[PDB]
Amino acid sequence: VHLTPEEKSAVTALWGKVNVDEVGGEALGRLLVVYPWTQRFFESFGDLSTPDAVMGNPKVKAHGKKVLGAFSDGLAHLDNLKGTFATLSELHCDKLHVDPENFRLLGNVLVCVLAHHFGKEFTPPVQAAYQKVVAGVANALAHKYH
């Protein structure tokens, strides 16, 4: 993206404090709860009938951890996201058939989760840096669609 050095440091500093397992589960769960249409891809996950059903679903939690793991890796290759995410992009398109707009929704949910978790530490400018990051990842993930 367009990350100033000080934006890159701000991202990295905060990311250091994140429990990826936990934030992953929280972001994926909230996605399925706020934009229920996104549940379309997880019919094998079981009970997604209520908020508690979603948030506590062991399958949602595990998938969340998988997704945020892949995301954390992306954070180390902020220079080459498209490269980093190319095989995942191809997979989401050709095998999973996941509309890329889902990637932007997840990005927004993650920002809300980071705000939820960090409170005041998630300053206006720290958010502006993350906004750029989630956009970049979403773009990277959509790059191989055809």
Binding site: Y35, H97, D99
Partner: protein, 141 residues
């Protein structure tokens, strides 16, 4: 909110589509798949090749529903309740895609209704497809 002039304009334009609605339904989809390749994510089970019978058939289906909405321009919510349900609880299409199909339908109409596609009619049809979109995405959550 469609004004009396809008409903008029829509009824007029759609009046001319006539026997070609199905063909236009089909061409709009074709234009969509080509221009906005992400929309294909919702049709993995279709043959998306040019002149595919699946696309043709679906084009018809979309057209007929638009026809039914024109006939019930006054009672859209009610006329498309079943379709709103299907899309909301079954298909679960992301709302952004409705804007893409709408634009492709406009383009298609422009290309085929030269005389009738005036600035005023373009505005009304845009508003119309927007209202149809709203109805189809209203029970999404």
């Amino acid at each position: 909110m469609l004004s009396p002039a809008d409903k008029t304009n829509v009824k007029a334009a759609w009046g001319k589509v006539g026997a070609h609605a199905g063909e236009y339904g089909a061409e709009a989809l074709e234009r969509m798949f080509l221009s906005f390749p992400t929309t294909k994510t919702y049709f993995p089970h279709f043959d998306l090749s040019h002149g595919s019978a699946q696309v043709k058939g679906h084009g018809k289906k979309v057209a007929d529903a638009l026809t039914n909405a024109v006939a019930h321009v006054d009672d859209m919510p009610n006329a498309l309740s079943a379709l709103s349900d299907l899309h909301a609880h079954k298909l679960r299409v992301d709302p952004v895609n409705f804007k893409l199909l709408s634009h492709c339908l406009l383009v298609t109409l422009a290309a085929h209704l030269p005389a009738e596609f005036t600035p005023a009619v373009h505005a009304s049809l845009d508003k119309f497809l927007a209202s149809v979109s709203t109805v189809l995405t209203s029970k999404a959550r």
